[PDB]
Amino acid sequence: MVIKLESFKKSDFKQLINWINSEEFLIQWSGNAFTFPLDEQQLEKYIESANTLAFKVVDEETSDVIGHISLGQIDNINKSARIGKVLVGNTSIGKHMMKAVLHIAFDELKLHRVTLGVYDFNTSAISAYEAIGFVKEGLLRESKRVGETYWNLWEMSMLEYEWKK
């Protein structure tokens, strides 16, 4: 019930790697950002990436880290950014994590548009995002290759007047 975001650091790398146990789960979580297996050299490159904020999700009651989230593609010209790398490591927590990052994107960074992508079979996550204000814009058909098949990605967004009004 009480979560906060903190900066994701080297000491949090191993926990994240242990949560990402398959190539398909890696892709569901992060798309084209990484190769399987996830490892510390890739995570170092991730946190050092320009225009990317990496966060661990902390349960304030226990101090345990229970997930991960990122605000990336921070674009100061178009005033936009993309939420991604959404992970609820321990068994809505997702809603609280999204609200915390939306506060950063809209209220601290003063952005105009925040995007998100979710693969179409993750209907529970899509419903949760729609409940807090994300809107489906379009389904990017067979846009991610996974082995010999292709996944469809729902491109979703929220504009500043949907958050602030």
Add this chain to the structure above:
Amino acid sequence: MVIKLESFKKSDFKQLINWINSEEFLIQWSGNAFTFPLDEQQLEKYIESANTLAFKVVDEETSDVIGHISLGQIDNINKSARIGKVLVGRGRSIGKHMMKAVLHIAFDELKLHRVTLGVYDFNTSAISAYEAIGFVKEGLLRESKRVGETYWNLWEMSMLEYEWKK
């Protein structure tokens, strides 16, 4: 009507720069790829880019350069690419021939699975021309491009390999 694509080269740079006469037209044509004014250094970086093909469109009968088109974001992992930097100087028919030529490269030469194309929502004639040759609207990316004090909406469109061979 006999059109061909040729590699866009240094000798074609000045003509393209003179055609892109305003920041708004630069954005309509190329989105976030460049800064205004368009210049030689930026075009050189463009043609030397990894995973990018730059073409001038030539009328075979006269040798006149009548447009520009690019196949970029060539992604060998997801087997996809994006058509962009579409410039047509007859326009509807030339645009259709230019798209077919680049789709031949993407699907028949490069063996890709998916080709995307973005067009700002006020270019209703171009969107209708793209739909006529098989492109499908996927979604409208709301207020995704800042232009001065306002935002433009982009129609994200696509064609899959089995739509090309239909």
